[PDB]
Amino acid sequence: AWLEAQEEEEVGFPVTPQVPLRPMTYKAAVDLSHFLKEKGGLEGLIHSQRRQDILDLWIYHTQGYFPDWQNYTPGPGIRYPLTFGWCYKLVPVEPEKLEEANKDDPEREVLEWRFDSRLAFHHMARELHPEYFKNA
């Protein structure tokens, strides 16, 4: 679909600018998670590095929601979603090929978006570092 960029990508020409900034509901994240899923399937898509901006940006020229919800725990390697409802967890399933030798492009470990709508009720990121969210 839109992720299957054969060669010369073509985002057609849909005119969708800053649309009425509605309130990003936690439910909005889960609904959005499944919306992007049926819109082709972002799951298993290896997040290179710029694809991240396309996501937040795409949401801009579409729902106009600001990326004040898209976030993740610091530190490299795995990366759990800080916000709740967002059932997306980045994880490097690639083999640690830290073979230092080729002086070409940086062959670092890339990450892939692991879709898991079960996060709609479970709470793993909370057991990791919840001290960031000060609710009560």
PDB file of C-alpha atoms in Angstrom:
ATOM      1  CA  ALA A   1       0.000   0.000   0.000  1.00  0.00           C
ATOM      2  CA  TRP A   2       1.481   3.385   0.967  1.00  0.00           C
ATOM      3  CA  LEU A   3       4.434   1.588   2.613  1.00  0.00           C
ATOM      4  CA  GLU A   4       5.106  -0.530  -0.502  1.00  0.00           C
ATOM      5  CA  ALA A   5       7.124   2.230  -2.206  1.00  0.00           C
ATOM      6  CA  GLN A   6       8.102   0.517  -5.482  1.00  0.00           C
ATOM      7  CA  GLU A   7      10.371   3.328  -6.754  1.00  0.00           C
ATOM      8  CA  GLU A   8       8.968   6.811  -7.466  1.00  0.00           C
ATOM      9  CA  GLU A   9       6.590   7.121  -4.484  1.00  0.00           C
ATOM     10  CA  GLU A  10       3.272   8.831  -5.350  1.00  0.00           C
ATOM     11  CA  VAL A  11       1.207  10.326  -2.502  1.00  0.00           C
ATOM     12  CA  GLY A  12      -1.391  11.344  -5.100  1.00  0.00           C
ATOM     13  CA  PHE A  13      -2.452  14.941  -4.322  1.00  0.00           C
ATOM     14  CA  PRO A  14      -5.112  14.895  -1.536  1.00  0.00           C
ATOM     15  CA  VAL A  15      -5.428  18.443  -0.130  1.00  0.00           C
ATOM     16  CA  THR A  16      -5.578  17.881   3.665  1.00  0.00           C
ATOM     17  CA  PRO A  17      -3.960  20.673   5.776  1.00  0.00           C
ATOM     18  CA  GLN A  18      -4.241  21.617   9.464  1.00  0.00           C
ATOM     19  CA  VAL A  19      -7.714  20.197  10.088  1.00  0.00           C
ATOM     20  CA  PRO A  20      -9.706  21.295  13.199  1.00  0.00           C
ATOM     21  CA  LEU A  21      -7.325  20.311  16.020  1.00  0.00           C
ATOM     22  CA  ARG A  22      -9.557  17.902  17.975  1.00  0.00           C
ATOM     23  CA  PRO A  23      -8.529  16.368  21.355  1.00  0.00           C
ATOM     24  CA  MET A  24      -6.232  13.320  21.031  1.00  0.00           C
ATOM     25  CA  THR A  25      -8.112  10.772  23.178  1.00  0.00           C
ATOM     26  CA  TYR A  26      -6.377   7.708  24.625  1.00  0.00           C
ATOM     27  CA  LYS A  27      -9.064   5.881  22.680  1.00  0.00           C
ATOM     28  CA  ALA A  28      -7.863   7.951  19.694  1.00  0.00           C
ATOM     29  CA  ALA A  29      -4.476   6.178  19.920  1.00  0.00           C
ATOM     30  CA  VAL A  30      -6.024   2.682  19.899  1.00  0.00           C
ATOM     31  CA  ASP A  31      -8.469   3.605  17.126  1.00  0.00           C
ATOM     32  CA  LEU A  32      -5.562   5.145  15.202  1.00  0.00           C
ATOM     33  CA  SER A  33      -3.366   2.084  15.856  1.00  0.00           C
ATOM     34  CA  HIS A  34      -5.949  -0.140  14.128  1.00  0.00           C
ATOM     35  CA  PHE A  35      -6.737   2.513  11.502  1.00  0.00           C
ATOM     36  CA  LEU A  36      -3.120   2.575  10.288  1.00  0.00           C
ATOM     37  CA  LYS A  37      -3.146  -1.250  10.465  1.00  0.00           C
ATOM     38  CA  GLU A  38      -6.041  -1.723   8.006  1.00  0.00           C
ATOM     39  CA  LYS A  39      -4.602   1.123   5.889  1.00  0.00           C
ATOM     40  CA  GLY A  40      -2.019  -1.429   4.620  1.00  0.00           C
ATOM     41  CA  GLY A  41      -0.167  -2.630   7.769  1.00  0.00           C
ATOM     42  CA  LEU A  42       2.579  -0.585   9.504  1.00  0.00           C
ATOM     43  CA  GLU A  43       3.401  -3.661  11.624  1.00  0.00           C
ATOM     44  CA  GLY A  44       6.740  -5.396  11.012  1.00  0.00           C
ATOM     45  CA  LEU A  45       7.821  -2.313   9.005  1.00  0.00           C
ATOM     46  CA  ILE A  46      11.528  -1.847   9.825  1.00  0.00           C
ATOM     47  CA  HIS A  47      11.705   1.752  11.123  1.00  0.00           C
ATOM     48  CA  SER A  48      14.865   3.054   9.392  1.00  0.00           C
ATOM     49  CA  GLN A  49      15.175   6.561  10.872  1.00  0.00           C
ATOM     50  CA  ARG A  50      13.280   9.080   8.704  1.00  0.00           C
ATOM     51  CA  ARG A  51      10.143   6.904   8.481  1.00  0.00           C
ATOM     52  CA  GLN A  52       9.422   8.148  12.024  1.00  0.00           C
ATOM     53  CA  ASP A  53       8.938  11.751  10.847  1.00  0.00           C
ATOM     54  CA  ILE A  54       6.702  10.601   7.962  1.00  0.00           C
ATOM     55  CA  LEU A  55       4.391   9.023  10.567  1.00  0.00           C
ATOM     56  CA  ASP A  56       4.088  12.094  12.829  1.00  0.00           C
ATOM     57  CA  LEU A  57       4.076  14.343   9.737  1.00  0.00           C
ATOM     58  CA  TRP A  58       1.509  12.197   7.893  1.00  0.00           C
ATOM     59  CA  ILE A  59      -0.777  12.550  10.929  1.00  0.00           C
ATOM     60  CA  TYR A  60      -0.311  16.324  10.506  1.00  0.00           C
ATOM     61  CA  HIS A  61      -1.532  16.841   6.899  1.00  0.00           C
ATOM     62  CA  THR A  62      -4.360  14.378   7.812  1.00  0.00           C
ATOM     63  CA  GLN A  63      -5.860  14.422  11.333  1.00  0.00           C
ATOM     64  CA  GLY A  64      -3.773  17.485  12.265  1.00  0.00           C
ATOM     65  CA  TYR A  65      -3.040  15.914  15.680  1.00  0.00           C
ATOM     66  CA  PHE A  66       0.211  17.327  17.082  1.00  0.00           C
ATOM     67  CA  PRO A  67       2.819  14.646  18.045  1.00  0.00           C
ATOM     68  CA  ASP A  68       2.511  15.463  21.777  1.00  0.00           C
ATOM     69  CA  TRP A  69       1.493  11.791  22.252  1.00  0.00           C
ATOM     70  CA  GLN A  70       4.140   9.934  20.260  1.00  0.00           C
ATOM     71  CA  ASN A  71       7.038   9.175  22.642  1.00  0.00           C
ATOM     72  CA  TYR A  72       9.213   6.306  23.957  1.00  0.00           C
ATOM     73  CA  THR A  73      11.578   5.462  26.836  1.00  0.00           C
ATOM     74  CA  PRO A  74      15.176   6.798  26.403  1.00  0.00           C
ATOM     75  CA  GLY A  75      18.307   4.638  25.977  1.00  0.00           C
ATOM     76  CA  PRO A  76      19.043   2.731  22.695  1.00  0.00           C
ATOM     77  CA  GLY A  77      18.058  -0.877  21.881  1.00  0.00           C
ATOM     78  CA  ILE A  78      14.411  -1.822  22.529  1.00  0.00           C
ATOM     79  CA  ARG A  79      11.942   1.063  22.956  1.00  0.00           C
ATOM     80  CA  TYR A  80       8.554   0.801  24.726  1.00  0.00           C
ATOM     81  CA  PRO A  81       5.795   3.425  24.085  1.00  0.00           C
ATOM     82  CA  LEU A  82       5.547   5.895  26.996  1.00  0.00           C
ATOM     83  CA  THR A  83       1.937   6.927  26.233  1.00  0.00           C
ATOM     84  CA  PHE A  84      -0.825   4.354  26.870  1.00  0.00           C
ATOM     85  CA  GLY A  85      -3.273   3.093  24.205  1.00  0.00           C
ATOM     86  CA  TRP A  86      -0.511   3.180  21.576  1.00  0.00           C
ATOM     87  CA  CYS A  87      -0.136  -0.565  21.013  1.00  0.00           C
ATOM     88  CA  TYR A  88       3.150  -0.097  19.099  1.00  0.00           C
ATOM     89  CA  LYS A  89       6.482  -1.410  20.493  1.00  0.00           C
ATOM     90  CA  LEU A  90       9.761  -0.968  18.584  1.00  0.00           C
ATOM     91  CA  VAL A  91      12.143  -3.962  18.902  1.00  0.00           C
ATOM     92  CA  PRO A  92      15.298  -5.026  16.907  1.00  0.00           C
ATOM     93  CA  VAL A  93      14.680  -8.627  15.753  1.00  0.00           C
ATOM     94  CA  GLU A  94      17.792  -8.291  13.598  1.00  0.00           C
ATOM     95  CA  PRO A  95      21.007 -10.140  14.673  1.00  0.00           C
ATOM     96  CA  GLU A  96      23.560  -7.977  16.542  1.00  0.00           C
ATOM     97  CA  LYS A  97      25.948  -7.748  13.556  1.00  0.00           C
ATOM     98  CA  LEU A  98      28.439  -5.418  15.299  1.00  0.00           C
ATOM     99  CA  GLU A  99      31.179  -6.644  12.929  1.00  0.00           C
ATOM    100  CA  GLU A 100      33.506  -3.610  12.782  1.00  0.00           C
ATOM    101  CA  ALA A 101      35.283  -3.770   9.399  1.00  0.00           C
ATOM    102  CA  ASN A 102      33.315  -2.329   6.457  1.00  0.00           C
ATOM    103  CA  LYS A 103      33.927   1.453   6.438  1.00  0.00           C
ATOM    104  CA  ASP A 104      30.831   2.060   4.266  1.00  0.00           C
ATOM    105  CA  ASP A 105      27.437   3.080   5.716  1.00  0.00           C
ATOM    106  CA  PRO A 106      26.741   2.665   9.490  1.00  0.00           C
ATOM    107  CA  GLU A 107      25.230  -0.842   9.721  1.00  0.00           C
ATOM    108  CA  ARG A 108      23.582  -0.160  13.104  1.00  0.00           C
ATOM    109  CA  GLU A 109      20.683  -2.289  14.401  1.00  0.00           C
ATOM    110  CA  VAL A 110      17.423  -0.975  12.884  1.00  0.00           C
ATOM    111  CA  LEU A 111      14.057  -1.191  14.746  1.00  0.00           C
ATOM    112  CA  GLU A 112      10.624  -2.468  13.536  1.00  0.00           C
ATOM    113  CA  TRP A 113       7.150  -1.398  14.710  1.00  0.00           C
ATOM    114  CA  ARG A 114       5.668  -4.451  16.508  1.00  0.00           C
ATOM    115  CA  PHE A 115       1.863  -4.037  16.500  1.00  0.00           C
ATOM    116  CA  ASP A 116       0.194  -5.543  19.609  1.00  0.00           C
ATOM    117  CA  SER A 117      -3.355  -4.147  20.139  1.00  0.00           C
ATOM    118  CA  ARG A 118      -3.356  -6.156  23.408  1.00  0.00           C
ATOM    119  CA  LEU A 119      -1.725  -3.085  24.990  1.00  0.00           C
ATOM    120  CA  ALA A 120      -5.319  -1.793  24.966  1.00  0.00           C
ATOM    121  CA  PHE A 121      -5.709  -3.445  28.401  1.00  0.00           C
ATOM    122  CA  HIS A 122      -2.282  -4.748  29.486  1.00  0.00           C
ATOM    123  CA  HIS A 123       0.395  -2.379  30.860  1.00  0.00           C
ATOM    124  CA  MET A 124       4.019  -3.503  30.430  1.00  0.00           C
ATOM    125  CA  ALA A 125       5.586  -0.053  29.873  1.00  0.00           C
ATOM    126  CA  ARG A 126       4.107   0.828  33.286  1.00  0.00           C
ATOM    127  CA  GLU A 127       6.173  -1.861  35.052  1.00  0.00           C
ATOM    128  CA  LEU A 128       9.321  -0.524  33.333  1.00  0.00           C
ATOM    129  CA  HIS A 129       9.390   3.202  34.240  1.00  0.00           C
ATOM    130  CA  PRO A 130       6.022   4.718  35.318  1.00  0.00           C
ATOM    131  CA  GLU A 131       7.637   7.342  37.593  1.00  0.00           C
ATOM    132  CA  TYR A 132       7.426   9.550  34.476  1.00  0.00           C
ATOM    133  CA  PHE A 133       3.598   9.706  34.541  1.00  0.00           C
ATOM    134  CA  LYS A 134       2.499  11.517  37.736  1.00  0.00           C
ATOM    135  CA  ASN A 135      -1.226  10.670  37.916  1.00  0.00           C
ATOM    136  CA  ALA A 136      -2.255  10.512  41.596  1.00  0.00           C
TER     137      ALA A 136
END
